[PDB]
RNA sequence: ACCUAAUCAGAAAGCCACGGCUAACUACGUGCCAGCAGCCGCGGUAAUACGUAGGUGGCAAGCGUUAUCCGGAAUUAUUGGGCGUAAAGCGCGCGUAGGCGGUUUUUUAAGUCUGAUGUGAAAGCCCACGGCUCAACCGUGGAGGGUCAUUGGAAACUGGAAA
């Protein structure tokens, strides 16, 4: 507004918040690295084999994996692709991005470098799922 | 970085009948693939500057990183960034080879440069994207007369520009002046080029 | 006082110098006081000696220790 | 109360042009006797008189129109009003509509136009536009 | 000492021996909003024999340090009014 | 002869009250690439037959735009209602940048300039009426030289 | 570093997409399922919007995905917004500091104006060239800092001072 008021208080701009909460900050030090920052990726360790549904009008079935992350906290997940060589308490790489119409799930289990290593059943969409073909 | 594959898909699917991947045509009722008078023709409002970006990119055989790195070489000229870009594409060593009639395409003009058979001022220049500065000439090495493919270009005269001295069999040239438009091209405005880059 | 120095610059496999002067307390790479001009080590497509003795005599008055291979510039 | 009446003069320039009036009777002083006699030598007003008594003498304005009863003055914009002061650079004051109008500056020499400042590179307060 | 900078300003209060505070005015321009703004640092000043009173306009020279903020040195009396 | 483009069409009516209306419309800009443009709106239920009614509505509208052969004479913020485009002259050689409703009007007057973006425009009808309101208010030097001195100002 | 002479075009190419946006389409299998999803969402009995081959488009020794930051966002708006009903005018007076202050003439130069000097070192971005066979980088020149200190002229408005 008035140039008198703008001297007396500047434009304190709009804060934003992260779309994906449970990563990427200095958390809660407890004389060791009790919890840390994972900007793109991490390890995991699993806790539960997941089976769930979307909720809005949709009626399909989905297979998450409710884990405890490497910084004491609890998140859901998802395995893209077909195969599932995963059981309880097995290491899984992470990468962010929510899943719409599921009520509370958080990230994608990377199908390349983990115990989630390689998914067969795919032949054209490949590097999104970690499937090889050394002929070409 | 080089474009290979002499199939007519560069001419027929773009549309223009230039001297690129095959000077003739044989499946003239159709476009490539099942795209044809049968099936979907996908047009756009940004495809009118796409096809003045895609119309040149296969012509010299250049990648995407080359044009943007040459779009702002015309920024060093006192004309605007879209005004002298076709001049700097007309001043490269590759299209001056075909302008001297020493090769038979612009792509055959890049084959006989890197393999040492065409030089500049005696010193071995083997760069197809070499900028011909004014006041320089065109050279060869001592083994350039035995080859049939230069003698192929001695058989047939191909293309005459206006900014050179024209020697189709002597294998030495002269860059007398900086070019202008409609000497090397014939069909492209300098106004649909620049709008793609914004 | 001060010591006459050649700041080495230059990329891989190609050094190049700039004639400077500062105390030995100052290092080679930087905190250099003045520059009396460049110096040209390689001689192919390049000169071989370069100096400007106008502001070089300003430093031989208050004291200067040229290194014994730099003194071959100013002997010529 | 009435703060900076120089804008109130240039308000009534816009008022009479809009409803297409002829006679404009405003009080004005030696600040504004320097003002409107710029544009008479620039082509906006038919005739500007002088103030009668230099304090309470009203300066009558008879505005200039076109032959088609078409408007000559498009609009007006104050620049340096009380609360934000604008002063001109050396040769870097801006142009009105790519040079087609008068930007009024009162430099260290008196009220001139933005054309006359580029012969002596002066700054001064950029008062109004056209 | 003999040639130091000068901050002429009003004398606020003589409250102890050999000590006053001589306030000055400084209008500072803002970074981007353009409109100037006042800031008035109130610097303490040694004076020789309680020569100042409340309200004087003076002339100030610097010195070499004495104590906490007693860093200036009064010279003149431009105005001796109240 | 002129040139036309279909900017937008809609499917606007009320579905069933006991009798169905489901009509279309169009907003066609017409031009000649010499400096005279226009725009008009008609409506019918057979799909491309409302275009011929819409080109019928725009041939009765011509707007003369001054030009220095490639750009505009000065800058202006063409505003109508809730829309506001900004337009400013370029140097010859850079082309007309988009604003799609405002893109196709500036090419049918025949210029090659920059175009600053639609500031507060939302819908493709008020982009068009703010474009034309910008173009019909520019000024020459000669008409200014009528009601002033005779080309002194340089 | 360079460079000649040899059996040999023979060793030396991917990767994501292809409803709409947005650049690029077809035939079946499953068929609100294994799924997919940046939003509109395409899936209840194939489905141009899921895996598959064909086809195409993009970039190219590199292609996609993630988390983070700026632009898109005139969506913190000095350059560049808003308050009757959409988010927003204190329930309303006296009122301290503060902000802004009509007209006249004369000084002062505190702002403002321009002149002069010194300084805000290399190196980068840009403005140019012998050269590394071009180029990335080096080389030389060039512009780039003052809301500063100090050194003269002008008195138009804003400001202290006389009527």
Q: What DSSP assignment string belongs to D78-98?
A: E-SBTTB--B--SS----STT
Give every strand in the sheet of F83-88, ordered side by side. F76-80, F83-88, F114-116
Annotate B75-97 with DSSP letters as a single string. Answer: GGSSS-TTTSHHHHHSSBHHHHH
Distance B193 CA to G140 C1' (A): 37
Task: Confirm if A75 and A108 have CB atoms less than 8 A apart.
Answer: no
Closest C-alpha among F65, F75, F150 to residue D94: F75
Task: Confirm if B100 and B161 have CB atoms less than 8 A apart.
Answer: no
Neighbouring C-beta atoms of residue B188, cutoff 10 Å: 16
A19, two tokens? 């779309």
CB contact under 8 A, F153 and D98: no
Annotate A26-41 with DSSP letters as a single string. Answer: -----SS-SS---SS-
Alpha-carbon distance of E33 to D86, in angstroms, equals 11
Between the CA atoms of D78, D80, D86 and D90, what dihedral angle is there, to the nearest 10 degrees?
A: 60
User: A101: Cβ under 7 Å from strand G?
Assistant: yes
Alpha-carbon distance of F99 to F102, in angstroms, equals 5
Alpha-carbon distance of A115 to F45, in angstroms, equals 61
Burial of C64 by CB count in 10 Å (0-12 exposed, 13-18 middle, 19+ buried)?
middle
User: B9: Cβ under 7 Å from strand G?
Assistant: yes
Task: Confirm if F120 and F82 have CB atoms less than 8 A apart.
Answer: yes
Chain F contact for D118, CB < 8 A? no
Strand G bases contacted by the protein (CB, 7 Å): 3, 13-17, 20-26, 32-41, 43-44, 51-61, 63-69, 72-78, 81-83, 98-105, 111-115, 121-122, 127-128, 130-134, 137-140, 147, 149-150, 153-157
Neighbours of chain F (3+ CB pairs under 8 A): B, D
Chain A contact for D82, CB < 8 A? no
Q: Strand B164-165 and strand A44-46: pairing? A: unpaired
Determined by cryo-EM
User: Angle at which helices F100-107 and F126-135 pack, to 10 degrees?
Assistant: 40
Alpha-carbon distance of D122 to D115, in angstroms, equals 11
User: C43: Cβ under 7 Å from strand G?
Assistant: no
User: D106: Cβ under 7 Å from strand G?
Assistant: yes
N residues, chain D:
130
Alpha-carbon distance of A70 to A92, in angstroms, equals 11
Q: What angle do CA B9, B14, B18 make, to 5 degrees?
A: 80
Q: Which nucleotide is nearest to B3 (CA to C1')?
A: G60
Burial of D98 by CB count in 10 Å (0-12 exposed, 13-18 middle, 19+ buried)?
middle
Distance F152 CA to G115 C1' (A): 31
Identity of the residue in F93, F96, F97 whose CB atom sits nearest the CB atom of B80: F93
Distance F151 CA to G28 C1' (A): 78
Q: What are phi and psi of E25, to 5 degrees?
A: -105, 135
Contacts of range D66-74, beta carbons closer than 8 Å, 24 or more positions apart: D66/F146, D66/F147, D69/D20, D70/F147, D71/D17, D71/D20, D72/D43, D72/D44, D72/F147, D73/D13, D73/D14, D73/D17, D73/D44, D73/D130, D74/D130
D25, two tokens? 């009777």
Question: Which chain D residue lies closest to F149 (C-alpha atoms)?
Answer: D43
CB contact under 8 A, D72 and F73: no
For chain E, strand residue ranges (E) read 10-11, 20-23, 27-28, 37-38, 42-46, 60-62, 72-74
Alpha-carbon distance of A79 to A114, in angstroms, equals 12
Neighbouring C-beta atoms of residue C28, cutoff 10 Å: 13
Closest C-alpha among A37, A39, A38, A121 to residue A79: A121
Closest C-alpha among B134, B106, B107 to residue B120: B134
Neighbours of chain E (3+ CB pairs under 8 A): A, D
Instruction: Give the helix/strand (H/E) hosting B50.
Output: helix B47-50
Between the CA atoms of A68, A69, A71 and A75, what dihedral angle is there, to the nearest 10 degrees?
A: -70
CB contact under 8 A, F73 and D98: yes
Instruction: Give the helix/strand (H/E) hosting B71.
Output: helix B64-71
Task: Confirm if F61 and F48 have CB atoms less than 8 A apart.
Answer: no
For D9-130, strand residue ranges (E) read 23-27, 45-48, 58-63, 77-78, 104-107, 110-113, 125-129
Distance B123 CA to G137 C1' (A): 23
Could you tell me the CA-to-CA distances from B8 to B32, B51, B63, B98, B106 in Å, in that order? Answer: 8, 16, 19, 20, 16
Neighbours of chain B (3+ CB pairs under 8 A): F
Start-to-end C-alpha separation, chain F: 38
Distance from CA of A3 to the nearest CA of E (A): 7
Alpha helices (H) along F1-154:
49-58, 100-107, 126-135, 142-146
Alpha-carbon distance of F135 to F38, in angstroms, equals 11
Alpha-carbon distance of C38 to C52, in angstroms, equals 9
For B97-169, strand residue ranges (E) read 118-119, 137-140, 164-165
Dihedral sign of CA atoms B79, B82, B83, B86 in order: positive
Task: Confirm if F70 and F111 have CB atoms less than 8 A apart.
Answer: yes
CB contact under 8 A, A2 and D84: no
F141, two tokens? 């030097």
If phi > 0 it is left, if psi is from -120 to 50 it is alpha, else beta; for residue D50 that is beta
Distance from CA of E32 to the nearest CA of D (A): 11
User: B39: Cβ under 7 Å from strand G?
Assistant: yes
User: D110: Cβ under 7 Å from strand G?
Assistant: yes
User: D113: Cβ under 7 Å from strand G?
Assistant: no
Distance B183 CA to G131 C1' (A): 32
Alpha-carbon distance of A42 to A20, in angstroms, equals 14
Task: Confirm if D20 and D46 have CB atoms less than 8 A apart.
Answer: no
Residues 129-148 of B near strand G (Cβ < 7 Å)?
Answer: 129-131, 133
Alpha-carbon distance of D38 to B167, in angstroms, equals 69
Closest C-alpha among A17, A81, A79, A68 to residue A42: A68
Give every strand in the sheet of A44-46, ordered side by side. A44-46, A67-69, A74-75
N residues, chain A:
136
B2, two tokens? 């080089």
CB contact under 8 A, A3 and E35: yes
For F75-133, strand residue ranges (E) read 76-80, 83-88, 114-116
Q: Is there an interface between D and E (3+ Cβ pairs < 8 A)?
A: yes
3-state helix, strand, coil in chain F (%, to 5): 20, 25, 55
CB contact under 8 A, F144 and D100: yes
Task: Confirm if D113 and D104 have CB atoms less than 8 A apart.
Answer: yes
User: D119: Cβ under 7 Å from strand G?
Assistant: no
Instruction: Give the helix/strand (H/E) hosting B64.
Output: helix B64-71
Interrupted backbone of chain C, residues before each interruption (C–N > 2.5 Å):
none
Interrupted backbone of chain B, residues before each interruption (C–N > 2.5 Å):
none
Q: 3-state DSSP call for residue F26?
A: strand
For chain C, strand residue ranges (E) read 3-6, 17-22, 34-39
Closest C-alpha among F91, F130, F138 to residue F112: F91
Could you tell me the CA-to-CA distances from F90 to B77, B79, C50, F95 in Å, in that order? Answer: 17, 13, 48, 9
Task: Confirm if F62 and F36 have CB atoms less than 8 A apart.
Answer: yes
Q: Strand E42-46 and strand E72-74: pairing? A: parallel
Task: Confirm if B166 and B104 have CB atoms less than 8 A apart.
Answer: no
Alpha-carbon distance of A66 to F96, in angstroms, equals 54
Burial of F32 by CB count in 10 Å (0-12 exposed, 13-18 middle, 19+ buried)?
middle
């Amino acid at each position: 507004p008035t140039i008198n008021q703008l001297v007396r208080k500047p434009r304190q701009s709009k804060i934003k918040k992260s779309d994906s909460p449970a990563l990427n900050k200095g958390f809660n030090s407890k004389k060791k690295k009790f919890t840390d920052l994972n900007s793109p990726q991490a390890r995991g360790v699993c806790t539960r084999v997941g089976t769930m549904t979307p909720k809005k009008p949709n009626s399909a079935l989905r297979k998450y994996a409710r884990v405890r992350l490497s910084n004491n906290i609890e998140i859901n997940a998802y395995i893209p692709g077909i195969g599932h060589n995963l059981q309880e308490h097995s290491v899984v790489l992470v990468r962010g991005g929510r899943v719409k119409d599921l009520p509370g799930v958080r990230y994608h289990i990377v199908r390349g470098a983990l115990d989630t290593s390689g998914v067969d059943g795919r032949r054209q969409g490949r590097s999104l799922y970690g499937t090889k073909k050394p002929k070409n | 970085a080089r474009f290979r594959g002499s199939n007519w898909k560069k001419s027929r699917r773009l549309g223009i009948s230039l001297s690129g991947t095959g000077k003739e045509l044989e499946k003239r009722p159709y476009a490539p693939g099942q795209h044809g008078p049968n099936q979907r023709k996908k047009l756009s409002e940004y495809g009118l500057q796409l096809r003045e970006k895609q119309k040149l990119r296969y012509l010299y055989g250049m990648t995407e990183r080359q044009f943007r790195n040459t779009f702002d070489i015309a920024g060093k000229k006192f004309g605007v960034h879209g005004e002298n870009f076709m001049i700097l594409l007309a001043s490269r060593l590759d299209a001056v080879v075909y302008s001297l009639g020493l090769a038979r395409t612009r792509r055959q003009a890049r084959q006989l440069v890197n393999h040492g058979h065409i030089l500049v001022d005696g010193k071995r220049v083997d760069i197809p994207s070499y900028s011909v500065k004014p006041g320089q000439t065109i050279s060869v090495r001592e083994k350039s007369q035995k080859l049939n493919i230069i003698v192929e270009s001695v058989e047939i005269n191909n293309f005459v520009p206006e900014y050179l001295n024209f020697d189709a069999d002597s294998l030495t040239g002269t860059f007398v002046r900086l070019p202008e438009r409609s000497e090397l091209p014939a069909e492209i405005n300098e106004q649909l080029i620049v709008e793609y880059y914004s | 006082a001060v010591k006459i120095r050649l700041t080495r610059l230059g990329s891989k496999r190609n050094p190049f110098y700039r004639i400077v002067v500062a105390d030995a307390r100052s290092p080679r790479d930087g905190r250099i006081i003045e520059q009396i001009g460049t110096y040209n080590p390689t001689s192919a497509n390049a000169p071989e000696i370069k100096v400007d003795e106008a502001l070089a005599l300003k430093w031989l008055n208050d004291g200067a220790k040229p290194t014994d291979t730099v003194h071959n510039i100013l002997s010529k | 109360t009435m703060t900076d009446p120089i804008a109130d003069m240039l308000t009534r320039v816009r008022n009479a042009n809009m409803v297409r009036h002829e006679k404009l009777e405003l009080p004005a002083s030696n600040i504004k006797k320097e003002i409107a006699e710029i544009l008479k030598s620039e082509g906006f007003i038919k005739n500007v008189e002088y103030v009668e008594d230099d304090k309470q003498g009203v300066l009558r304005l008879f505005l200039k129109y076109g032959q088609n009863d078409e408007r000559v003055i498009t609009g007006l914009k104050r620049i340096s009003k009380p609360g934000l002061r604008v002063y001109a650079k050396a040769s870097e004051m801006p142009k009105v509509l790519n040079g087609l109008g008068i930007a009024l500056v009162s430099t260290s020499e008196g009220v001139i136009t933005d054309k006359e400042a580029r012969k002596r590179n002066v700054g001064g307060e950029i008062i109004a536009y056209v | 000492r003999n040639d130091r900078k000068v901050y002429v300003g009003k004398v606020v209060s003589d409250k102890m021996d050999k000590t006053i505070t001589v306030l000055v005015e400084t209008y500072k321009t803002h970074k981007l909003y353009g409109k100037r703004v006042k800031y008035s640092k109130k610097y303490k000043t040694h004076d020789e024999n309680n020569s100042a009173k409340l309200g004087d306009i003076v002339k100030i020279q610097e010195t070499r340090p004495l104590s906490a903020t007693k860093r200036f040195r009064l010279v003149e009396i431009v105005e001796e009014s109240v | 002869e002129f040139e036309e483009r279909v900017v937008t069409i809609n499917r606007v009516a009320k579905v069933v009250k006991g009798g169905r209306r489901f009509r279309f419309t169009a907003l066609v800009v017409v031009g000649d690439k010499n400096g005279r443009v226009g725009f008009g709106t008609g409506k019918a239920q057979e799909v491309p037959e409302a275009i011929k009614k819409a080109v019928e509505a725009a041939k009765k509208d011509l707007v003369v735009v001054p030009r220095v052969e490639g750009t505009t004479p000065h800058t202006i913020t063409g505003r109508y209602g809730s829309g506001s485009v900004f337009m400013k002259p370029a140097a010859p050689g850079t082309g007309v940048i988009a604003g799609g409703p405002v893109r196709a009007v500036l090419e049918l007057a025949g210029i090659t300039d920059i175009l600053s973006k639609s500031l507060g425009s939302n819908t493709p009808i008020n982009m068009v009426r703010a474009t034309i309101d910008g173009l019909q208010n520019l000024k020459n030097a000669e008409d200014v030289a009528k009601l002033r001195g005779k080309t002194v100002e340089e």
